[PDB]
Write a protein that binds this ligand. Structure first.
Ligand SMILES: CCc1c(-c2ccccc2)c(-c2ccccc2)nn1-c1ccccc1-c1cccc(OCC(=O)O)c1
Length: 131
């Protein structure tokens, strides 16, 4: 994950409101989150990866070891069972809750960190760059 490590800032978003609707996020949360411009602070210490984010919407953080499932409280307040793995240099993040699943992939592309969120056919792409 050496290439993921650092402080990242959101530079663009596409279809994130639709992805959120598909996830089940309610109107007001969708409006406020859609407006936010979160950063990501990604760090690695031994086998533990931490993804931290500060924004006006919410400050959240997850720490995890690849391949090992963990409890996650998402920024929209879902309690999910999550596993994050590395597949050919792509971080693959699967969230399970209420019989539902969503997969989020993060990859380095040129100088960008590209986040792709997928649920039931709806994809959002969020692009980050180094702060
Ligand atoms: C990056 C900050 C953040 C937001 C957010 C989104 C928009 C504005 C403000 C904050 C959310 C979120 C997800 C779904 C619904 C409502 C909020 N989760 N995290 C987060 C915070 C720590 C670790 C991981 C993740 C995360 C998990 C799953 C999908 C994600 O993809 C959104 C993106 O990469 O931009 C991001």
């Amino acid at each position: 994950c050496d290439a993921f490590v650092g402080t990242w800032k959101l530079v663009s978003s596409e279809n994130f409101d639709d992805y959120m609707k598909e996830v089940g996020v309610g109107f007001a949360t969708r409006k406020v989150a859609g407006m936010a411009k979160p950063n990501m602070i990604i760090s690695v210490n031994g086998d533990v990866i931490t993804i931290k984010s500060e924004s006006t919407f919410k400050n959240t953080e997850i720490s995890f070891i690849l391949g090992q499932e963990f409890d996650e409280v998402t920024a929209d307040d879902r309690k999910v069972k999550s596993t994050i793995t590395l597949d050919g240099g792509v971080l693959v993040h699967v969230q399970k809750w209420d019989g539902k699943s969503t997969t989020i992939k993060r990859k380095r592309e040129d100088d960008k960190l590209v986040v792709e969120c997928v649920m039931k056919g709806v994809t959002s792409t969020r692009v980050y760059e180094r702060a």
